[PDB]
Ligand binder design. Structure first.
Ligand SMILES: *[C@@H]1O[C@H](CO)[C@@H](O[C@@H]2O[C@H](CO)[C@@H](O)[C@H](O)[C@H]2NC(C)=O)[C@H](O)[C@H]1NC(C)=O
Ligand SMILES: *[C@@H]1O[C@H](CO)[C@@H](O)[C@H](O)[C@H]1NC(C)=O
Ligand SMILES: *[C@@H]1O[C@H](CO)[C@@H](O)[C@H](O)[C@H]1NC(C)=O
Length: 145
């Protein structure tokens, strides 16, 4: 089901009219995939899927559909209806969420821990994957580089 990865990447990229660039990020992968007293995985940088808790300090982020960022005061609270791939991506100074066809971005410094617990296929991301995108001929094309 490569088209799921391709659609994600096409939505991520939209670039200027004449772009040919390699994008290196914690993109959804195809090698590991998991489908299961809860599951714990460590050292994740991002997590994608077709109740998820990512611990951090002072802030943490969870998805139960409702997604929230709160201490332990709240910074984010969004509710939404459900070939879209969803997921969370986090960095020292920001949180990026991919939900229901929209990309959201929140800014705040937080110490993240590589600990994620969940209670439905999951796609954990441990490292950076590179993709090349080229839209120079008017159509955006995605390939490996
Ligand atoms: C980039 O590399 C991945 C493998 O890491 C390619 O994935 C293949 O996709 C086809 C369908 O298009 C599947 O039938 C293969 O089984 C997949 N390979 C593996 C190892 O799972 C991907 O197609 C490559 N990108 C492009 C544009 O070709
Ligand atoms: C995501 O891709 C879908 C097509 O699968 C498209 O309809 C939707 O508008 C895209 N979202 C963004 C933010 O580009
Ligand atoms: C752009 O390149 C793709 C891939 O080769 C091709 O399918 C598409 O038709 C091309 N666009 C134009 C306007 O030729």
């Amino acid at each position: 089901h490569w088209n799921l990865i391709e659609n994600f990447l096409l939505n991520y990229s939209i670039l200027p009219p004449n772009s040919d660039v390699v994008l290196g990020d914690y993109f959804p992968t195809v090698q590991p995939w998991f489908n299961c007293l809860y599951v714990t995985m460590e050292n994740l940088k991002a997590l994608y899927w077709d109740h998820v808790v990512v611990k951090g300090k002072p802030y943490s982020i969870t998805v139960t559909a409702i997604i929230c960022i709160c201490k332990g005061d709240c910074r984010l609270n969004h509710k939404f209806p459900i070939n879209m791939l969803y997921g969370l991506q986090w960095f020292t100074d920001e949180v990026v969420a991919y939900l229901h066809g929209a990309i959201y971005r929140i800014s705040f410094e937080n110490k993240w821990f590589g600990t994620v617990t969940l209670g439905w296929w999951f796609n954990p991301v441990y490292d950076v994957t590179y993709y090349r995108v080229n839209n120079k001929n008017g159509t955006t094309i995605v390939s490996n580089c």
